[PDB]
Amino acid sequence: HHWGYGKHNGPEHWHKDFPIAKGERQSPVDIDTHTAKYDPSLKPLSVSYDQATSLRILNNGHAFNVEFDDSQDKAVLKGGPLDGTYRLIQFHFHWGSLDGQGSEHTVDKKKYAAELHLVHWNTKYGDFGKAVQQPDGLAVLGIFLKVGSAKPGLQKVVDVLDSIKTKGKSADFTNFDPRGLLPESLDYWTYPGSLTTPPLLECVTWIVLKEPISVSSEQVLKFRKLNFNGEGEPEELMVDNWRPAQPLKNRQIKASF
Numbered sequence: 001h002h003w004g005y006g007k008h009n010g011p012e013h014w015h016k017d018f019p020i021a022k023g024e025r026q027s028p029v030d031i032d033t034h035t036a037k038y039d040p041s042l043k044p045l046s047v048s049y050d051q052a053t054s055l056r057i058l059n060n061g062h063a064f065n066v067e068f069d070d071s072q073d074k075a076v077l078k079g080g081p082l083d084g085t086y087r088l089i090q091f092h093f094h095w096g097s098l099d100g101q102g103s104e105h106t107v108d109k110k111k112y113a114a115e116l117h118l119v120h121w122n123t124k125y126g127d128f129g130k131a132v133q134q135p136d137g138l139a140v141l142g143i144f145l146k147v148g149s150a151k152p153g154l155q156k157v158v159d160v161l162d163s164i165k166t167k168g169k170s171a172d173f174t175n176f177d178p179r180g181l182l183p184e185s186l187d188y189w190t191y192p193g194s195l196t197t198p199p200l201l202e203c204v205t206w207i208v209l210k211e212p213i214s215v216s217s218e219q220v221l222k223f224r225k226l227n228f229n230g231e232g233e234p235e236e237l238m239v240d241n242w243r244p245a246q247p248l249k250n251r252q253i254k255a256s257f
Ligand SMILES: NS(=O)(=O)/N=C1/NCCS1
Pocket: 117, 119, 140, 194, 195, 196, 197, 198, 199
C-alpha cells in the first residue's frame, strides 16, 4: 500500500507514513498576490543551464524525471533568495486530467494545467542526499504551464514518453536543453517550503515564476497517456499527480518584482 494520488493512498493519507505532511513549512501553497511583498534584498536570479547534461528519463510511478549529470558544476541556479550555488539534478512535472487543474502551487486560487519543477541541491552539502537533511538544502524552480500554443522545446520530451509508458521504465535521454522550457521573464515569488511528494522534507527554497509557459493541447494529452501502473498491470492513467495547497502557517511569500 504505498503512497500515490488515489482515494485510498492520496495526499489526505500521506501523513500516516509521513507525519511531516502536517508540518510547519509544507508545499505547495496558494500564492496570494496581494499579500506577497516585494523584497528589495533579493539579488538578481541567475539560471545558468548552458552546459546542462541530461542523461535519462524515467517513469517512477508518480511522474517522469529527466535526470542530469550533476557530478560537476554545470547547470546551476544562483542569486535571488539563494546563498551560494545550487546544482540541477532533475526536472519533472505535475499535471491534471483536464486543462483546468494540475498545478500544485496556485495563484490567487487559480490552478494551471501543469507545473514544471526543476530540482537543485545546494553544493555546500556535497550531494543531494546530504542536502535533504538541511533546511536550505534544495531550491526548486517552479514554472506554470497553460494550454495554448505549443512549446517547441518541450517536444523532445513529449516524443519519448511512448517508451516509458509504465512504472519503472527508463530511456536514454541525452542533450536535452532545459533552457527551452523557460518563459521570457524571470519574475518570481519565493518562500520556504518542502518537497511536495513523500517524504515531504522541509528543505526547499521555492522559486515560482510568475510567467507561465504555453504548451499545446496535444503536448499535455501525451502526458496524460502515461501510466501509474507497471507493465502488464491494469491501466491507471498518470493524471492528477498534484498535491493541493497546504496551510501557509508562519510564512511570508516575497516577490522579486
Ligand atoms: N515535487 S517536488 O519536486 O517537491 N518533490 C520532490 N521529491 C523528490 C525530490 S523532488
